[PDB]
Structure formats: C-alpha cells, structure tokens
Design a protein around this nucleic acid. Structure first.
Ligand SMILES: [Mg+2]
Ligand SMILES: [Mg+2]
Ligand SMILES: [Mg+2]
Ligand SMILES: [Mg+2]
Ligand SMILES: [Mg+2]
Ligand SMILES: [Mg+2]
Ligand SMILES: [Mg+2]
Ligand SMILES: [Mg+2]
Ligand SMILES: [Mg+2]
Ligand SMILES: [Mg+2]
Ligand SMILES: [Mg+2]
Ligand SMILES: [Mg+2]
Ligand SMILES: [Mg+2]
Ligand SMILES: [Mg+2]
Ligand SMILES: [Mg+2]
Ligand SMILES: [Mg+2]
Ligand SMILES: [Mg+2]
Ligand SMILES: [Mg+2]
Ligand SMILES: [Mg+2]
Ligand SMILES: [Mg+2]
Ligand SMILES: [Mg+2]
Ligand SMILES: [Mg+2]
Ligand SMILES: [Mg+2]
Ligand SMILES: [Mg+2]
Ligand SMILES: [Mg+2]
Ligand SMILES: [Mg+2]
Ligand SMILES: [Mg+2]
Lengths: 146, 151, 36
RNA sequence: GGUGGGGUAACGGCCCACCAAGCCGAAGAUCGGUACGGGCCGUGAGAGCGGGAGCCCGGAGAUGGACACUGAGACACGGGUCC
RNA sequence: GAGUGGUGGCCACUAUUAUUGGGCCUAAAGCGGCCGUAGCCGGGCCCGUAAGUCCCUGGCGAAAUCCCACGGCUCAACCGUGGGGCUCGCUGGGGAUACUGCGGGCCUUGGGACCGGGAGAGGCCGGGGGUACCCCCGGGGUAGGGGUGAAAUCCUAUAAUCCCGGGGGGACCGCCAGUGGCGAAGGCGCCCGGCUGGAACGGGUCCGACGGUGAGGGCCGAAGGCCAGGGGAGCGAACCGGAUUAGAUACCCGGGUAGUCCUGGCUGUAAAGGAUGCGGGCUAGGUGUCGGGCGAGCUUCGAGCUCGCCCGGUGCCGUAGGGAAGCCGUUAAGCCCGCCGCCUGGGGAGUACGGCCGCAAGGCUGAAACUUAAAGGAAUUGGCGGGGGAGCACUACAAGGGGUGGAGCGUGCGGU
RNA sequence: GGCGAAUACGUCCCUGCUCCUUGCACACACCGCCCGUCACUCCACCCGAGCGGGGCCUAGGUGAGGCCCGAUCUCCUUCGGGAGGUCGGGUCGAGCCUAGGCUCCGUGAGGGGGGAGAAGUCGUAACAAGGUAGCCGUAGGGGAACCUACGGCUCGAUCACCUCCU
RNA sequence: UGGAGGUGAUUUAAAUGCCAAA
C-alpha cells in the first residue's frame, strides 16, 4: 500500500466522495440515518410505557448461574403488542395480580438491551396501579383496591 | 522503467558536456549539410544518417553548430532536411510502428491460435495511438487523420 | 460465492467445502418451486 | 428556442396560431425518502460532530378540495358560494 | 446536599471515520492478470499576462445572542454606555510577480524510435524420432500366475505366468536438470526446418515531456463442467464383485462407464499465494549464481580457462531503522513525492428479495429482524502423541523354578 | 533356624518411569477437547394457494359550480342604465361511475432454513503422523458428520539419500 | 555451526467418558 490518496490541492471532490462512501461501514451512523431502531421499537421511542398484565411466568438464569427470575407478560395500550417485563425485588411478584396495569421502562443493559444472566428480557416494572413498586416491596405503602 | 514490461535497463549514451566543436574537427557547416543531403538521397533513416556520420566521417552530433539562418537555435538533421524539402511527411517513429503492425497482422491471418503474438500487436497499437494523440496536439498531423488497420 | 478465508479454519466447525455443497443443494430446491 | 398576437399593475410559454428540433443527465438527470429556512443552540483543546419548538427576521395555513364580491391592499381565522 | 437516584436521546470517551490524524505478509482488508477513456498528479531555462494567491483601501453581511472594562438595582444573576468579535461570505478600485494556470521560445536527463554482436522449456505451423506399455499371429515349455498385514475375488489344459521372431495402436518425452532460464499472470522441457512477440548489454545515433495511475469499458485466464463431430492404449468419479469390521454406503484387492487426447464454441472459477497494487528519489557492508561489456594473465589456440571491475536478473547472512512478535532489512514490511482498489467486534450470511449475464451447472451485485462477550494473532511454561533419540525396572519382558483360577474348609468384602 | 536348586549376565517387543528434541485447536491438562443429522421446548424470520381491505397513474362516461358572448322576459329608472328569471353557444372545472395497470396493510392451509436450551438418540469428522496428513476449486455418491476422482497450496509428522547456501 | 528445497518409502484391528467438582 502506497501513500494515502488523494492528496492533491485540487482533489477536494474525490476526497469528500471517499469519506462519504466509507462512512456507511460504520454501524452506528447507518442505524441513525436510516432510523432502523424506530422501525422495530415496540415502545415507539418513548422512555416509559403503560400496559396490562396477562399472566405470570418464570425464567431460568443462564449458565453457570442458578435460579428462577419472576416476570410478567404485558400487553401495551398504545399499540397492542405483548412484551415481557422483569419484576425487581425480593418477593415483589406477590404484589402483582392478573389484569392490573403497570408502567414499564428499559432494564438498562449494554446497547439499550438486556442485562445480566437473563437475556431476552428488555424491560422492568416500575409502577403497579399507579403506586411505586419499590415502596410496596419496602413497605411504607399499601396496594390500592385490595 | 519500461512502458509495459516494467524492467529497468539503463544502457544509453553518455554525452560529455561541451559547447564548441572540437579542434581536430575540420569540416565546415556546408560540407556537413552536403553530406547529410547525399546520405538522405541514398535512402537512409534520420537515426542512421547520424550513425554513419559518427562512425565513418568522425563527426560527433551535428548539434554542435549554430543554425546559420536562425541564430537562436542549434542544428539538427531534421531541420537540415527541412531546409531542402527532403523531410518525411509522417514522423519516423510512427511510420516504423505502423510498418511493424502491418507485417504482424498478415502473420496472424495464417496463425489464428498464436495468442502470445497477438498481445504484442495490442501493445504496438497502444503505442501508435499514444503517438497519434501527441502529434495531433502539436499540429504535425491533420485533425482528420486516422489510423485504420483495414486501410 | 464470495471468499471468506476465515471460514476455512477448522476449529469448532465442520468443513467449509461440504457446507458450500449443502447450501447449493438447498438453493436448487427453492429455484424449482419458484418455477412452478 | 424563434416569429406574430392576447392577457397582466408589469417582463416572461403566462396562454394561443405558425415554423424548427431542441432542453436536462454518471461533475448524478428523473424518481423515491425525510424535513418549514436563517440569526442561533448542545458538546469538544482545537479540527469537527449533532439539533434547529419557545425570542427576532422571512414563508405557509385556518376541518379536506375548488371558486368569487368589496377595496389602496384579500380570493379574507371571529365576511360570502359549491362538493 | 434542598436536593439526590432510575429510563431513553446527542456530544465526548474514540486516532472505532483518521484534512490535521488510522489501517490492508501471518489478526477485518491489494481486484486472478494486463491494456486503456474521463479525472487527479506531472522534468530544466528565458520572455509576456495577471485568472488563482498576497498586501492597501471604498460599500455591505439588522437587532438580540458571545468576550472585556466602567456604571444602576445590597453584590450577583439582570440591565445601560463604550471597545471588540460573529453571520469566513459578496462586491468597486489600487499595488506585487516567487509559486499554480494561460500564450510564445529554447533544451535532454524521464519515456519512445533505430543500429550491432550475443542469451533463453516465450508462442504458432510442418516433418522426423525415443524407450515404455496394451492387443493379435507364429515357435519353445508345462502347472501355476497375480495380490495382501493375512487372504479371497480374478487369469490359466481353448496351454497362462516366463523366453524368442513379427504385425497394430494411443498417450508421454527419463538421466543431463542447476533457491538455473523465459513469460503480465495462467503457464512453458526429445530433435531438425519455417513464421513471430518481448527483454538485457554496447551506443558524443534520432525525436523532444510525447509521462504515472486509472472510475466506467476491453482482452487473456489451471483443473473440472456443458454443446456438436472424432478418437480411446494406460489410469479411472458413478457402478459391479472380494475382504476388514459391532456396522463399513470407506480406507486395501480384482474389474469398470463418463472423463482425461484432437477439431469449433460456451462457462470465467482456485490456498489463481510472494496470502505482500503499480511508477520515482534516497539510506553500511559480506558472499554465491545467470546474461552482456571492459582489463589482466594462461592456453591443447577452442564460441576455451582463472582473477578483477560496471550494468541488469536471481539467492543467502547482516548494520541503521521498522514491528505485537515471528521477522523484514538497496529484490524493504525503512524515510519521502503520487494515483486507484478494499476494511471498520463475532454470528445470521455470502443467505433472503430485486437486477444483469449463461443452453445448463452456475457467475457478479447484496440487506434486515434476531443473537452473542468475546471471536482472532504472535510468542512462554507444562502435560500428552497409535512422533524421533538416550537410559532403566523380575510389583516389565526374554531363559527358568514353583504356583493361583476347578473341590472342601479358615478368614475378610459386596448383597440380601 | 534345617534342607537347598534351575536359568540369564541380555533387550526395550509387552507393562511402565526419567532426561534431550519436535507437533498441538489441550491447562479440569487425552479419563482432554470437539462435529453433524433425527426427536423435544421456546423465539425471530422467509416462500406461499386463498381470503379480505386502502393508495396512485391511465382510458372512457358523467358532472355541482365559475367566466365570456348572444336572444328574450319581469320590476325599478336620475333615461345613462341597474337587479334578477328562462333558452342557446363557447370555455374552465372539484367531485362521481366503469375498465386496466402498479403499490401498501391484515389474515392465511402448507413448506423452509436460522438462533437459544439440555440431553432423547446414532456414530467419531477435526486437534498428535488424531491413527487414510489437513485444506481450496469443480463433479458424482452416501442415515449424519463425510467418501472418491483431476489440477493446486503448506497453514504437513518421521527415516534414508540427494541438491542448493551461510 | 546454522538453514532452504526435491525424490522415495513408513507390517492387522484399537469406539467412548461416565460418575464428582456443585
Ligand atoms: Mg432543517
Ligand atoms: Mg410553543
Ligand atoms: Mg464506548
Ligand atoms: Mg484501528
Ligand atoms: Mg484475514
Ligand atoms: Mg493480486
Ligand atoms: Mg487475492
Ligand atoms: Mg516543473
Ligand atoms: Mg488575482
Ligand atoms: Mg448584530
Ligand atoms: Mg449599588
Ligand atoms: Mg457590577
Ligand atoms: Mg444589554
Ligand atoms: Mg505359443
Ligand atoms: Mg492503465
Ligand atoms: Mg500457483
Ligand atoms: Mg542483484
Ligand atoms: Mg537479514
Ligand atoms: Mg435472483
Ligand atoms: Mg505384574
Ligand atoms: Mg516369561
Ligand atoms: Mg481355588
Ligand atoms: Mg484452555
Ligand atoms: Mg478420546
Ligand atoms: Mg478420526
Ligand atoms: Mg484423518
Ligand atoms: Mg464412492
């Protein structure tokens, strides 16, 4: 490989063309300009969402960890899609009942995705029937309407 | 390097730096012009005339005498021939290349499977086209002049 | 096909030649169903 | 694009009659996508990269699509007609 | 600290977009090779011009927003009076000529043309040969030949294997042969004749910058495959038998179709690898070998031999420098001046959809959803090998003596 | 304590251990590592008969309304004409209907590979000469990893000989 | 001393990794 080209004083057009051509090999640039995330995001670019609980499930941790992580299936009000949301806390699943409404947000893993030993779950529960879940787990408050 | 083969031969002439003709040279300008005209009328090429003048008459390159008519430039064989109307119509190297191409084409009619010789023909014609472009730019050839092997 | 000489390395995979043969077999069947 | 007219507050294929074959394009035409433009704003040592709701200047609209009366000025958000 | 945490977005981190300022031998990445159009980059001197470029000066680029000093609200945030900046952009004039551009003149160093004596498996066409192998006919002789780790299938009393005298056929050119030669690469090796391409050396010969790279475009391109017509000795996909094995759709053995060969086309693919794109300048030495030239000494006078130097090829060891290291090192992977091509964590995937080309097989172009924390390179210490070498042992063998395993019983263990 | 022999004075063939050298995808260190089909669970995607629903171009028909030029009618006139109705002609025109062609959304019988999981199953293809060296191109065959033929590369181990160098 | 190539050969069969580490 010789010297980097073009270097000429009157070769601006070719240099700009080259830089534009090879910028499409950058995955971050390509996804932003083509808006690929907005096309497949169930939350439609929102930071939080509201949904209705359909059922409770449990997911096994990946190797070499052991345990069951409690999660729920949530149907979104805004577009009707169904996602899976993790319930953080010790014994927090006992405060969830079927047909309740919840507020969910991102779980906070790398690249805006999943984290830890539970891939496939991208969201977590924040509120239950307009009451903070963290309070309910700690106490200090009672779940409304029984 | 070479135009196509990319070799790096270095053989050539090593002309010493001098301005005036040597002392031991005794021919005058007119004698040299007469010799050049005679040799041209015998039917020699421009490169061959200088070779004969150097080898047999002891005359190093004629580019040691000022042009008597135009003091701003030195003398060359082609200029001497132009002063008498014996200069070639087509530049000599172009003519030689065209002559080489014509002979090779009639060989390839009887040997259609000689593919290695055909590449030589392609390279020769590339050289011819380079030369014709250059000569069109300088005005040594008419603008409508074209190279067609079918001629 | 395009060249990926990284695929020819044998650690943790089967031979690339036979993967290529298998893919070519698979592509024939799709082409036949497309013509129907 | 030319020649001869009409219409306009006014020049103009703006619109007609007639005569020609032109005009744009790999230095990206045509088509598709996404967006009101700028002064400015965020970040970075700088070179740069990203945004352009709120205040000022310019543009466009009044449920969607068409069309008129009055007037110096409108085809008019709190004036008129049709679908 | 009256705040402090969670989720999403942009910049920085990031020299992971590189003009400043990155990479492509072995880690992602140089098109299989070459020719050439636009574009970009272009040798030395003299004269002119003033477009680019530099300096001076007029008319502009609203205010708000930014920076500085002073002044008013208690100081500040905020606001006022001045000085700068910002919209890096446009335009009227004057001056300069080093560089780039443009016009003219003059050169020979880069490139090309030509002449001389030589070198070479470079290419195409015609002719003549060399052993070897297979089949057929005739003579001799008689019971086996062939093949494997061991065998069997197979050939043989219609006389095989082996030896001798003849006839026919198709493919291929042994030793000499050389990190030797030629070609852009793929590739090229019997001898004589004809046609033809390129390169090196010698050159006070000729022309006079005619040059480098090259998007699109064009031509060449191992083996295999396909379409028509020939040929078919040996070898041999598919297939048919004999074995091995738990099975053996294989490795081994006996046969065998297509193909391998020639003529006219198509396909355009390889670990097509020097895994290293091409042109130019420069930066210690040492030592082999091929071609040409020069000098000296020998000589059987040979187109012969030995030594030294210059140019061009082809190898090895190595200094400065480079590199992650292996290593490279005037045949650079070192310092500098150019142009084109390509790469941006691992998979999905060279896949899906669309387009072009091909008789077909196939070629070129080429994503996304989703998934993942490594994948990848060079080197170190051990352990291992149905790898090599050296040594050793009656809880190893070889040469020997005596036994245990079968019966009844003593005692210990599993099970029930 | 009594009685009291046979054979060898060697080799690394079997079983093993020590050191030098070499290859390695092993370090839990060969009782290592590791590949593909079929079966089971879950996720995203592709092809797709049929089934509905939208959007653009064309072609034909129709057309609310607008403008201009005529004829005629009714009522007012300051006699200049104004306000409107009906018929005729010309031109522009949103919308609507039919046909055709492209394109988007929702379902969808059936088919196809991909990715995770952990083991239901059959074998042992690659790493040491991995027990037939491995790999690239093309073609044929096979439950599956794979096997065979022609040309190529070293990113191939061991012994003997030969060649070319420092 | 240390390197780079070429030609020959290379005597039957020999699959797997559970339990545990947890
Ligand atoms: Mg904008
Ligand atoms: Mg607002
Ligand atoms: Mg980062
Ligand atoms: Mg990098
Ligand atoms: Mg690579
Ligand atoms: Mg290459
Ligand atoms: Mg390559
Ligand atoms: Mg110059
Ligand atoms: Mg100027
Ligand atoms: Mg201002
Ligand atoms: Mg005060
Ligand atoms: Mg103050
Ligand atoms: Mg102020
Ligand atoms: Mg006989
Ligand atoms: Mg070129
Ligand atoms: Mg090769
Ligand atoms: Mg040399
Ligand atoms: Mg070295
Ligand atoms: Mg297609
Ligand atoms: Mg024992
Ligand atoms: Mg014994
Ligand atoms: Mg017993
Ligand atoms: Mg390991
Ligand atoms: Mg094993
Ligand atoms: Mg094996
Ligand atoms: Mg093997
Ligand atoms: Mg077979």
């Amino acid at each position: 490989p010789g010297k980097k080209a073009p270097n000429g004083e009157f070769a601006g057009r070719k240099l700009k063309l080259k830089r534009k051509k090879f910028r499409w090999s950058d995955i971050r640039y390509k996804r932003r300009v083509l808006r690929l995330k907005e096309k497949s995001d169930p939350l439609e670019g929102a930071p939080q969402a509201r949904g209705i609980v359909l059922e409770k499930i449990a997911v096994e941790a990946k190797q070499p960890n052991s345990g069951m992580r409690k999660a729920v299936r949530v149907q979104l009000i805004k577009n009707g899609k169904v996602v899976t949301a993790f319930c953080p806390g010790d014994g927090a699943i006992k405060f969830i009942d079927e047909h309740d409404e919840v507020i969910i947000e991102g779980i906070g893993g790398p690249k805006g995705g999943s984290m830890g030993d539970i891939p496939g779950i991208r969201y977590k529960v924040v509120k239950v029937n307009r009451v903070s879940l963290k309070e309910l787990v700690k106490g200090r408050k009672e779940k409304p309407r029984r | 390097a070479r135009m196509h083969a990319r070799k790096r031969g270095k053989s050539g002439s090593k002309r010493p730096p001098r301005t005036a003709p040597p002392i031991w040279l005794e021919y005058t300008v007119e004698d040299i012009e007469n010799l050049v005209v005679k040799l041209r009328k015998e039917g020699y090429s421009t490169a061959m005339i200088g070779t004969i003048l150097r080898d047999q008459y002891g005359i190093p390159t004629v580019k040691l005498f000022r042009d008597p008519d135009n003091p701003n430039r030195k003398l060359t064989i082609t200029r001497i021939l132009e002063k008498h109307g014996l200069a070639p119509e087509i530049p000599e190297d172009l003519m030689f290349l065209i002559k080489r191409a014509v002979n090779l084409r009639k060989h390839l009619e009887q040997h259609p499977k000689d593919l290695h010789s055909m590449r030589g023909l392609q390279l020769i014609e590339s050289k011819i086209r380079r030369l014709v472009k250059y000569y069109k730019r300088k005005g040594k050839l008419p603008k409508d002049w074209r190279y067609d092997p079918e001629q | 096909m395009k060249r990926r000489p990284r695929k020819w390395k044998k650690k943790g995979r089967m031979r690339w030649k036979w993967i290529k043969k298998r893919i070519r077999r698979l592509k024939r069947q799709r082409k036949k169903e497309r013509g129907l």
